Amino acid sequence: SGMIRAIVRAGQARPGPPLGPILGQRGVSINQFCKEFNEKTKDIKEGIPLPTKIFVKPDRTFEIKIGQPTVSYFLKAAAGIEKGARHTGKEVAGLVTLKHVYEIARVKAQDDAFALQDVPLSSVVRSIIGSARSLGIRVVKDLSSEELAAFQKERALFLAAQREADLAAQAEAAKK
């Protein structure tokens, strides 16, 4: 039938949308796919998302190809934040060191993309740096002793003020 891309959680493979109707229209069952995915990713920490490609054949059979997790997840973990920044460039979400970037690149090099592409780690580090720039996470050369926490305190205060301002704007739009 064709190939389907899906970013699925490690062990949280539910038989509902946004993956149920697609596979159902393709013809493949959903419970079989969820079982196979859970048995294939049971060794993975339940919760982290990873892209996978499902090749559905004309005889209603399917094969699964699982790769490395999402770079956004890798960066959020390495920075210690739950959600990225809204206004990229104007605000800073986290702080990741080139060491952490190199480790992320080394763990991610063994995927479909960077396997089909014989490319050294330099370009993968560049891709990770670009992804971090898009997420809004700064990459300092060598700065992590306690100033990471010094910036984390200001970031938490900024997030609190942002939540209060968002609630105030919602209340204003409600009473207007």
Partner 1 sequence: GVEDYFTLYADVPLNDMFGYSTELRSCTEGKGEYTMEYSRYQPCLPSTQEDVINKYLEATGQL
Partner 2 sequence: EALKDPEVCTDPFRLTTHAMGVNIYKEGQDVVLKPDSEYPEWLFEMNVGPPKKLEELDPETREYWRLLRKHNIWRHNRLSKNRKF
Partner 3 sequence: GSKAVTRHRRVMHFERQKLMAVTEYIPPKPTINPRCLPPPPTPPQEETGLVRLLRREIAAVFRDNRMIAVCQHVALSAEDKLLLRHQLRKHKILMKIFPNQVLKPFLEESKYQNLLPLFVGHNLLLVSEEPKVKEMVRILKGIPFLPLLGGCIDDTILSRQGFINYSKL
Mask: binding to partner 2, 21-50, rule CB under 8 A, as x and -? ----------------------xxxxxxx-
Q: Cβ of residue 117: shortest distance to partner 3, in angstroms?
A: 6
> Which residue among 2, 5, 16, 82 contacts partner 1 (CB under 8 A)?
16
CA nearest to 63, candidates 31, 36, 44 = 36
Instruction: Tell me if 9 contacts partner 2 by CB under 8 A.
Output: yes
How many of the chain's residues bind partner 1 (CB under 8 A)?
Answer: 9
Look at residue 60 and give its three-state secondary structure: coil
Site for partner 1 in 24-53 (CB under 8 A): 24, 29-31
Nearer to partner 1, 21 or 130 (CB): 21
Told to check if 66 binds partner 2 by CB under 8 A, we report no
DSSP of 78-129, one letter per residue?
HHT-SS--SSBTTB---EEEHHHHHHHHHHHSSSHHHHHTT--HHHHHHHHH
Which residue in 79, 82, 54 sits closest to 67, CA to CA? 54
Which residues contribute to the site for partner 1 (CB under 8 A)?
Answer: 15-17, 20-21, 24, 29-31
